[PDB]
């Protein structure tokens, strides 16, 4: 049944799945939402994030290489969970969570509190307990993943903002009702993509505690401001995504779709890493000269638009 797919599920996790069975569908959608955004944020890059599996199997043992990209994958996966869990509870209908009901301070002047403020705290705590039910390793990879998972979570809290409805005469905004709310998930993906661009690189150090040797991370370049709880960290170099990685890094860029106009990464010199690019032409049928007619319908004409698609060699 559910959480079965997870391939290194430990009993602490399974207990959580069963205690929180009523919101586990939204945990699952959370992950799917994050990886979907990942694929959007890297839609034109050498690594386009279609490697990654969107199932709950990402929970459980973290064994992928400690690259910047993984730092982002896990971050946006945590945030997706915190997001979708908060959003689902806000849709009502669930016994263990709902709208955030706790007394909010006296309102701003134009308005009154109302609606359904999203319980972002609940979602973040669910994100964290499920990730933390994982078996705990003194791993360097586990220290990084603890850090980035929290950075993804925390910005779900950070992105809560005011949203108001205007009612009163003819919708006039002088009778206003506000609630705490989440952005579209795109705000989250854009935010973390920036944090991806500024991710701090670390080095591995190790000190002993009572259960043996632990490994900790330390900023590699001390002269800069160290990473914070909201920053992304990593400590392995990312591979060359040009060629199919024989050590299952990833595939090549071969036959990835290409943009002749652009001289950035999504362009055909960079995306194809100096190899050529093929080209084929294609035709699609579509509606084009649609007239409106008083009243009230629309008439469309069929015509065939042609475009060319360059794919890397």
């Amino acid at each position: 049944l559910l959480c079965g797919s997870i391939p290194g599920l430990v009993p602490k996790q399974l207990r959580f799945c069963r205690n929180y069975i009523e919101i586990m569908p939204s945990v699952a959608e959370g992950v799917k939402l994050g990886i979907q955004e990942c694929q959007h944020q890297f839609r034109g890059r050498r690594w386009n994030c279609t490697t990654i599996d969107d199932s709950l199997a990402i929970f459980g043992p973290v064994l992928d290489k400690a690259t910047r990209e993984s730092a982002f994958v896990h971050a946006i996966a945590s945030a997706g969970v915190a997001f979708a869990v908060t959003r689902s509870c806000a849709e009502g209908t669930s016994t263990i969570c709902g709208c955030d009901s706790h007394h909010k301070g006296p309102p701003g002047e134009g308005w009154k509190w109302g609606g359904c403020s999203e319980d972002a705290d609940f979602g973040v705590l669910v994100s964290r307990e499920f990730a933390d039910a994982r078996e705990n390793r003194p791993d360097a990879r586990s220290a990084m993943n603890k850090h980035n998972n929290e950075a993804g979570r925390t910005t779900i809290l950070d992105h809560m903002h005011l949203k108001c409805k205007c009612h009163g005469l003819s919708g006039s905004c002088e009778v206003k009702t506000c609630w705490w709310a989440q952005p579209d998930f795109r705000a989250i993906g854009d935010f973390l993509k920036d944090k991806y661009d500024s991710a701090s690189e670390m080095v591995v150090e190790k000190h002993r505690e009572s259960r043996g040797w632990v490994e900790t991370l330390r900023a590699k370049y001390s002269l800069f401001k160290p990473p914070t709880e909201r920053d992304l960290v990593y400590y392995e170099n990312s591979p060359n995504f040009c060629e199919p990685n024989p050590e299952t890094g990833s595939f090549g860029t071969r036959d990835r779709t290409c943009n002749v106009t652009s001289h950035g990464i999504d362009g055909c010199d960079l995306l194809c890493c100096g190899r050529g690019h093929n080209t084929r032409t294609e035709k699609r049928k579509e509606k084009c000269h649609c007239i409106f007619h008083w009243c009230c319908y629309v008439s469309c004409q069929e015509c065939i638009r042609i475009y060319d698609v360059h794919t890397c060699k």
Partner: protein, 120 residues
């Protein structure tokens, strides 16, 4: 997405029968839309503009087509005819034309990006 039949009394009989929700105003159900546009009934009744009623519903119960699913607002000209006819009335009591019916947000005939509803 789904085209639902128009239920709000004011907007029954305007020349198209099917709307969708939510509208541009985030009205979730067609009744919630109704309870706002029905506040305009006195203005429809006075007949300050013969376009007022069609214009109002073209925003609150926007036309919904099975055939064609791109945006289809009223043309700016429709709103402008309605504002020309009815804003004077509201001004006599000190009221401006409501922000939601601001005409300048609406397209004009000949816009490539989108079509618009008006007679000619």
């Amino acid at each position: 997405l789904a085209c639902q039949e128009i239920t709000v009394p004011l907007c029954k009989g305007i020349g198209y029968n099917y709307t969708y929700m939510p509208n541009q105003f985030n009205h979730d159900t067609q009744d919630e839309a109704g309870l706002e546009v029905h506040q305009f009934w006195p203005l429809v009744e006075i007949q300050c503009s013969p376009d007022l009623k069609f214009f109002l519903c073209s925003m609150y119960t926007p036309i919904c087509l099975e055939d064609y699913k791109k945006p289809l607002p009223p043309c700016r000209s429709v709103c402008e005819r309605a504002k020309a006819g009815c804003a004077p009335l509201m001004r006599q009591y000190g009221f401006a034309w409501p922000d939601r019916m601001r005409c300048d947000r609406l397209p004009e005939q000949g816009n490539p990006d989108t079509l618009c509803m008006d007679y000619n």
